[PDB]
Ligand binder design. Structure first.
Ligand code: 1EK
Ligand code: 1EK
Length: 122
């Protein structure tokens, strides 16, 4: 019960504003899509939720591609992020690269979007 209490509420704002990387937040995957790479290996963009907010500017490190390609990491799964870095683009947007993560609960075991998160603004 209280499914939202499974997620690190407030982590998205903390990552995007304080830029603290010492945290190991538990987030839900809402959606995953490949992004166009020329002839580079595939790259995945994730829409993640901390229960309060969603954020669409997560990228998976390519070393984690098999998680997606063998379907252990998919929409609705709950993951703990163990290592990430934030990079800021020339235009001021920030991207969060997920380097290490652990799936705590598979999509099948969660089965739904937790809570009613709203998009994080900027
Ligand atoms: O529109 C789509 O379907 C793909 S989304 C997307 N595609 N390329 C990027 C870019 S552009 C760029 C330029 C310099 C360094 C990193 C990136 C990244 Cl990385 N993003 C991107 C931009 C902001 C947040 C997340 C991904
Ligand atoms: O795959 C991995 O194991 C790591 S992927 C990765 N790690 N740092 C980055 C960088 S360096 C950098 C410099 C300026 C603006 C954005 C970025 C980004 Cl962002 N990327 C990155 C570079 C190009 C495209 C997407 C991500």
């Amino acid at each position: 019960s209280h499914m939202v209490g499974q997620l690190s509420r407030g982590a998205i704002a903390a990552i995007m504003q304080k830029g603290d990387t010492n945290i190991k937040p538990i987030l839900q995957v809402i959606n995953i899509r490949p992004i166009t790479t020329g002839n580079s290996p595939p790259r995945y963009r994730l829409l993640m939720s901390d229960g309060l907010n969603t954020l669409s500017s997560f990228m998976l490190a390519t070393q984690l591609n098999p998680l997606v390609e063998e379907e252990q990491l998919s929409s609705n799964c709950v993951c703990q992020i163990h290592r990430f870095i934030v990079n800021t683009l020339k235009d001021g947007r920030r991207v969060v690269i997920l380097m290490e993560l652990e799936v705590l609960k598979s999509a099948e075991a969660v089965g739904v979007k937790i809570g009613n998160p709203v998009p994080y603004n900027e």
